[PDB]
Antibody, heavy 215, light 210 residues
């Protein structure tokens, strides 16, 4: 098990330190690797550490920037990155080097680098419009607008509704604030008898709102 | 330092088809490995030492190659195999760009819904009009907004889902954002959709008063 750290937000110029805690195997016998993944690009190798000896191998591109340490008695490899620029916004994985393949990998830590400030979302009902009657299928949704940072969690009827739900990827507007839509498809008839509520929770703001979407 | 180039970068394939993806090593390298990643998970060990499949990798996958060209072939494409495939080499620790593999299915024309601004958004002075193209294939769809039957440019954004798991269709939303002032100057808001599975483009409209 390689349990990595939480989502990390940061301003340009700053620095960040993110852990990768290991369990099971004997931490000192295996090099720990750190790979960067940035949307629209592949996987980039940053470097590795041998915690038994602390010798390290760095990719040239990250030499002045990343630093790999390992507090051996605590089974936690670390990595700080320095002078964060917009291009370090990405997902960082640590993975164990078994020898000829990376075999385990931690879930990722997302770092967002931006000058922008936390903003909770405004939630707006996208009321059962189009085909609502003459269709047999009606679509309803919530518009989760102007929030920063990612992520937001939208769910319908406290989880009691899954079928037909399409929550779309957040898009980032000119203002550097994101917005998304969660839309659900229901049979036109249900509109008179059910109540559709979407539940939006944005934790970096501690925003939890529920919205009825009535036709 | 060894640069790996993968081709194709996107590939659609019907289940039962045979796919083959390349990863070419710029400088002759001894062993090639291959990782698979599905949306929202870490890479998984798939092929290693040019052709040994790891433990779990079903019989249909197959590494092959020497020096500068390696390949991953799937014999009978299955629906569960759609993912991005990256090849990896151990001297520079480089990886190649990925080959996303999607499943081909039959053309399915979008249902288009359109939604007017809620009142709550309007009191706060902005107006977002959403147009939804629901469950379709291929992913290529073209959505044009017209306000008082005149085309709009530069003030919409769209987001597309990743291919549905049991269905294989995409969904796309396009949002037009206006100030309340601008919204109120115009009357007919229409979403025009062009897509393969449509003999003529669907338009869906609402009129601001009505």
């Amino acid at each position: 098990q390689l349990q990595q750290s939480g989502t990390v937000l940061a301003r340009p110029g700053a620095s960040v330190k993110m852990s990768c805690k290991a369990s099971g195997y004997s931490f000192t016998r295996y090099w720990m690797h750190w790979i960067k993944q940035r949307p629209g690009q592949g996987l980039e190798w940053i470097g590795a550490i041998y915690p038994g000896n602390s010798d390290t191998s760095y990719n040239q591109k990250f030499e002045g920037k990343a630093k790999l340490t390992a507090v051996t008695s605590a089974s936690t490899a670390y990595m700080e990155l320095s002078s964060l620029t917009h291009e370090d916004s990405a997902v960082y994985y640590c993975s164990r080097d078994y020898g000829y393949y990376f075999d385990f990998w931690g879930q990722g830590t997302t770092l967002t680098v931006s000058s922008a400030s936390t903003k909770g979302p405004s939630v707006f009902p996208l009321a059962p419009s189009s085909k609502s009657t003459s269709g047999g299928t009606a679509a309803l949704g919530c518009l989760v607008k102007d929030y920063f940072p990612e992520p937001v969690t939208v769910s319908w009827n406290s989880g009691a509704l899954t079928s037909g739900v399409h929550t779309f990827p957040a898009v980032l507007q000119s203002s550097g604030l994101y917005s998304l839509s969660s839309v659900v498809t229901v049979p036109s008839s249900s509109l008179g008898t059910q109540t559709y509520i979407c539940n939006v929770n944005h934790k970096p703001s501690n925003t939890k709102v529920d919205k009825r979407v009535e036709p | 330092q060894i640069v790996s180039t993968q081709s194709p970068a996107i590939m659609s394939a019907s289940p039962g088809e045979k796919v083959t993806m390349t990863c070419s090593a710029s400088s002759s390298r001894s062993y090639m490995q291959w990782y698979q990643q599905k949306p929202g998970t870490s890479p998984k060990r798939w092929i290693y030492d040019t052709s040994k499949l790891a433990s779990g990798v079903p019989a249909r996958f197959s590494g092959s190659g020497s020096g500068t060209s390696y390949s991953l072939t799937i014999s009978s494409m299955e629906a569960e195999d759609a993912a991005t495939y990256y090849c990896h080499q151990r001297s520079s620790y480089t990886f190649g760009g990925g080959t996303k593999l999607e499943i081909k299915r039959t053309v399915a024309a979008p249902s288009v819904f359109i939604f007017p601004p809620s009142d709550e958004q309007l009191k706060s002075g902005t107006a977002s009009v959403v147009c939804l193209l629901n469950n379709f294939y291929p992913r290529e769809a073209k959505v044009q907004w017209k306000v008082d039957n005149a085309l709009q440019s530069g003030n919409s954004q769209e987001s597309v889902t990743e291919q549905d798991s049991k269905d294989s269709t995409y969904s796309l939303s396009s949002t037009l954002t206006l100030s309340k002032a601008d919204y109120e100057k115009h009357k007919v808001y229409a979403c025009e959709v062009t897509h393969q599975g449509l003999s003529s483009p669907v338009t869906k409209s609402f009129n601001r008063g009505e």
